[PDB]
Amino acid sequence: RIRIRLKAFDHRLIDQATAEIVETAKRTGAQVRGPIPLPTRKERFTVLISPHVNKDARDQYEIRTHLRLVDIVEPTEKTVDALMRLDLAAGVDVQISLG
Amino acid sequence: EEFDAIKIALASPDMIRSWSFGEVKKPETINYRTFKPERDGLFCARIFGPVKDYECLCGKYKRLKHRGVICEKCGVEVTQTKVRRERMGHIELASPTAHIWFLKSLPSRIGLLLDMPLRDIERVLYFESYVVIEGGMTNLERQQILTEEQYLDALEEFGDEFDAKMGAEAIQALLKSMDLEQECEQL
């Protein structure tokens, strides 16, 4: 089975990507597993915002890396190849893995 | 272009290699999944060229300011499909092979070149006799055709320096060891 790991910072974008991938899968092949949402990584950062000194002065940023696990149960001839030409939107790191 | 003569002659194997752009090695023609041909059978792409104009099999070059560079994936020179009308390929035969037009055209050119009748040449070229090459200081001649028992005789008594072969290799050794100056002077 083809496991697909979508990773992105924007959630909407990721969602869009996932849908597209599903569409790509579903026309060619059959029995797409589904878009399973894994836990989001909220990598936080604190920094001092003064140039020199004021320690209680701080900004707390974060990067929300979202995960989408799409799986394809039956890899056909037509389906797997379809993704080669079918590149997804920018800012979405995909990671296909058969078996 | 411009020309005033059409010359016809025989073709050396180096000439057939120099016409040829590749070598056919397999007998498949089309994939019949798609109609993209099989490498490198009869219908090919890396021997004979692209099916579609400037349309590389793998697809990577399709610019007007990007012409001349060849492909790297399928290695198909993105050119025109008219070149599949003019590129030729070659087959390397594993054993040599007698051409039929010089064997059975009545008269036989291999026949009245070797000073040898056509029945002996047909019984040698189809692997059912033995002709002699490099007979040595024995009882046997040069153009003497043999049979199975006589080759058993000649390999029991003269398994050394005597030699004889059969098939197209033997005819090729006869035709290669032919000295034309001696035959001109002797005739």
Binding site: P75, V80, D81, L83, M84, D87, V94, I96, S97 | K73
Partner: protein, 175 residues
């Protein structure tokens, strides 16, 4: 003493020719005039393999080996076996046995069928591998990774962009 001879059959019906030949022997009961019948051996599938299944093994290109003697009755017997063209020899009067000096070296090679062999091979990323098994069959790609410790060449089927990266066995894909 029974010497060997070569029989030509319609290539593809060779096992059925061998079975019909054994049956014609046990019909016309010249049992003292036939020793064996040797057909499609020396299997190797394609490349290497240490498991079962696989199959698609064939070396015999259409010739049937027969331990025999030569009487004209047994010659008519073998050519009256159906789907048999004839013997292959110097002549059709007295057809030809093969050899015996090349049987000693062939015996040592047949005894080493499975004891200590299977030479190693190699590969590299270029230009692209070929897939002929699973849904990825009929597709080509490149091997970005080649695990020699797990014997698994990572090939994404050589497609522009991030398509479908996957793992295929050496026999599962062709160079």
């Amino acid at each position: 003493k029974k010497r060997w001879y070569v029989v030509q059959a319609f290539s593809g019906f060779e096992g059925r020719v061998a079975t019909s030949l054994r049956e014609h022997i046990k019909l016309h009961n010249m049992e003292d005039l036939f020793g064996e019948v040797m057909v499609p051996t020396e299997e190797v599938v394609e490349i290497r393999g240490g498991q079962r299944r696989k199959s698609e093994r064939k070396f015999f290109p259409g010739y049937v080996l027969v331990q025999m003697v030569m009487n004209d009755a047994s010659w008519h017997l073998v050519r009256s076996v159906p789907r048999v063209m004839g013997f292959i020899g110097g002549t059709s009067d007295r057809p030809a046995p093969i050899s015996d000096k090349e049987v000693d070296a062939i015996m040592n090679r047949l005894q080493q069928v499975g004891d200590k062999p299977r030479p190693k091979t190699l590969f590299e990323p270029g230009e692209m591998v070929r897939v002929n098994d699973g849904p990825f069959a009929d597709f080509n790609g490149v091997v970005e990774e080649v695990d020699y410790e797990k014997s698994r060449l990572k090939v994404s089927v050589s497609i522009f962009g991030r398509a479908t990266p996957v793992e295929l066995d050496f026999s599962q894909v062709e160079k």
